[PDB]
Amino acid sequence: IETVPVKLKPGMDGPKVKQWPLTEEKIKALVEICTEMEKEGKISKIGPENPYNTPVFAIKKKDSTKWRKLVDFRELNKRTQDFWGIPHPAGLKKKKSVTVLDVGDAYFSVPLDEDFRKYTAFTIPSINNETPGIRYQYNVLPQGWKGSPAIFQSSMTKILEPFKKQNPDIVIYQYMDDLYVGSDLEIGQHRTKIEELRQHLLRWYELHPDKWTVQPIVLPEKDSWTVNDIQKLVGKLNWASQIYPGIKVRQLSKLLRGTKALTEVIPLTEEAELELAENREILKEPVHGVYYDPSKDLIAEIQKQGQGQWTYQIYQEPFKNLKTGKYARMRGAHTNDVKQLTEAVQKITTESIVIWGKTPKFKLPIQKETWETWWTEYWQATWIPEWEFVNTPPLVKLWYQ
């Protein structure tokens, strides 16, 4: 009910990001939504004296046909001053289950600092540039802005104070417009407790971190090896030697002596079996000296494995993986690679939010134009991470398969 002054970083002007084209149905949905919000005072129209702009588009979240309004506040977020910190809950990732709630509506009750409102301007575009776009700015705390949770932290703490005092075994975390609730109950008791918390938030996405861990490097176990089998094995072990110190491949390369056919069976010598066993024992241990640095960026790499299978690695230093995984979920994206990649980006980003409380920078195996053309059609999250595009096919593909 009282506005807190908000400013920008020194020497930085407001965002001036071009609005990209939208389909007619998304434009109509945003027209209806923004009209309703204008009748409720959440946004107000602006004149040409406001040169700032932030992209906007429309989505449809899970299990809902209602269009939702999504603002790409990335540029404004990184141009907004740093708000200060609550240490990340290191036990949220250790809990048995976590449920994500959309507490975005609660932001619309808190007014926004007047002098800052000119920086949240956005444009509903028109088809074929026929008429001028409909320009708005926010009067209250907008969803997607990084200052909205920072400002609401006191109010949110006051709201959840009884629930936190009631169940000390339930971890509560907040990121952007989402509230993460970790516990160890039963799925039924979990859902009933979530209904209790959502009505507790009313009067004022099952995710199990235990079923996801880190993945070791595994070598084949065969009774007969071909020249090709041993060539691939030596390639993979040589690659893993960048990660593990003691990997050696000389006794296995000694078997390849000569110009043999690739399909010819080669029996393993005893020295070769010994070297392979030592390499197994080395791979069974974790990686040497792998730490998380909150001052550094998180990098995520995604490889397409085919047949709807995808691998990913989150690291900070090359060969120092903080997390690895393999998203192979099939949910109505059998014939669309971009939809699969987008859902994978969303899941990986969510995991990254749970573990470290921030999003990673993605390296996407897709051409810039395809992704930029289609990614908003399958996006369902309220946040947006950063991404770049790898254009050279990496060789370490099958080494993660």
Partner 1 sequence: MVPISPIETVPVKLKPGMDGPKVKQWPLTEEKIKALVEICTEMEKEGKISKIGPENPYNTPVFAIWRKLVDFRELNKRTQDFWEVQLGIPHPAGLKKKKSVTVLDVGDAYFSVPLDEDFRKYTAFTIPSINNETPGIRYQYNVLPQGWKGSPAIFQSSMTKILEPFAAQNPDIVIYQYMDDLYVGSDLEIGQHRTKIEELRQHLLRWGLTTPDKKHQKEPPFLWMGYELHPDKWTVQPIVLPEKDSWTVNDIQKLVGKLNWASQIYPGIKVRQLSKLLRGTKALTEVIPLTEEAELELAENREILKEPVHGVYYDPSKDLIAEIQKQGQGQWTYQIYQEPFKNLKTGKYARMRGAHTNDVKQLTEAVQKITTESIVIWGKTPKFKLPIQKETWETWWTEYWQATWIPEWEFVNTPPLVKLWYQLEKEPIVGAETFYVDGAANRETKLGKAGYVTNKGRQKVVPLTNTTNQKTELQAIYLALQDSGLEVNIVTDSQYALGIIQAQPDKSESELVNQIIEQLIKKEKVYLAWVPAHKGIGGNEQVDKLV
Binding residue positions for Mg(2+): 102, 177-178
Tokens of 127: 């088809």
Contact between 43 and partner 1 by CB under 8 A: the answer reads no
State the nearest-atom distance from the C-beta of 304 to partner 1, in Å.
Answer: 6
Distance CA 291, CA 204 (A): 41
Among 3, 324, 370, 380, binds partner 1 (CB under 8 A): 370
308 binds partner 1 (CB under 8 A): no
Residue 261 within binding range of partner 1, rule CB under 8 A = yes
Q: Tell me, what DSSP letter sits at residue 195? A: H
Q: Tell me the number of residues near partner 1 by CB under 8 A.
A: 64
Q: Is 167 in the site for partner 1 (CB under 8 A)?
A: no
Contacts of 293 by beta carbon, 8 Å cutoff, 6+ apart: 316
CB of 184 to partner 1, least distance (A): 37
> Which of 73, 97, 122, 15 minimizes the C-alpha distance to 382?
73
Query: Which of 59-67, 102-110, 348-356, 368-376 is the region at the interface with partner 1 (rule: CB under 8 A)?
Result: 368-376
* Residue closer to partner 1 (CB basis): 88 or 304: 304
Which one, 366 or 381, has the nearer CB to partner 1?
366
369 binds partner 1 (CB under 8 A): yes
C-beta separation of 327 from 347 below 8 A: yes
Which part of the chain contacts partner 1 (CB under 8 A), choosing from 136-144, 186-194, 197-205, 262-270? 262-270
- Say how far apart CA 358 and CA 10 lie, in whole Å: 24
Instruction: Note whether 390 and 208 are within 8 A (CB).
Output: no
Asked if 219 and 280 touch (Cβ cutoff 8 Å), the reply is: yes
Stretch that binds partner 1, among 95-103, 194-202, 257-265, 347-355 (CB under 8 A): 257-265
Q: How far is the CB of 159 from partner 1 (least distance, A)?
A: 38
Residue found by looking up tokens 């069974």 in the block: 284
Scored b (16 or more CB within 10 A) or e, 339-368 reads bbbbbbbbbbbbbbbbbbbebbebbbbbee
What mask, x for binding partner 1 by CB under 8 A, covers residues 208 to 247?
------------------xxx--xx-xx--x---------
- By beta-carbon proximity to partner 1, the closer residue of 180 and 371 is 371
- Measured from the CB atom, is 127 or 214 closer to partner 1? 127
CB of 178 to partner 1, least distance (A): 26
Within 13 A of 164's CA, how many CA atoms are on the CB side?
Answer: 10
Which of these ranges, 75-83, 92-100, 143-151, 251-259, lies near partner 1 under the rule CB under 8 A?
Answer: 251-259
Interface with partner 1 in residues 51-80 (CB under 8 A): 51, 53
CA distance 32 to 24: 12
The encoded tokens of residue 362 equal 């993605």
3-state helix, strand, coil in the chain (%, to 5): 35, 20, 45
Cα separation, 358 vs 93, whole angstroms: 13
Shortest distance (Å) from residue 301 CB to partner 1: 13
- 236 versus 323: smaller Cβ distance to partner 1: 236
Closest C-alpha to 17, from 384, 390, 357: 384
Pairing of strands 68-71, 56-59: antiparallel
Residue among 292, 284, 290, 278 nearest 248 (CA)? 278
9 lies in the site for partner 1, by CB under 8 A: no
Q: Which stretch binds partner 1 (CB under 8 A): 137-145, 189-197, 313-321, 370-378?
A: 370-378
Nearer to partner 1, 111 or 235 (CB): 235
Residue type, 22: L
Q: Which is nearer to partner 1, 187 or 328 (CB)?
A: 328
Residue 369 is encoded by which pair of tokens?
Answer: 């134009």
β-pair partners for 135: 123
Quick check: 349 binds partner 1 (CB under 8 A)? Answer: no
Q: Which of residues 103-162 bind partner 1 (CB under 8 A)?
A: 127-133, 135
| Residue 122 and residue 134 in contact, taking contact as beta carbons nearer than 8 Å | no
Residue 265 binds to partner 1 (criterion: CB under 8 A): no
**Binding positions for partner 1, rule: CB under 8 A:** 18, 21-24, 27, 47-51, 53, 127-133, 135, 226-228, 231-232, 234-235, 238, 249-250, 253-264, 303-304, 306, 336-341, 364-367, 369-371, 373-374, 392-393, 395, 397
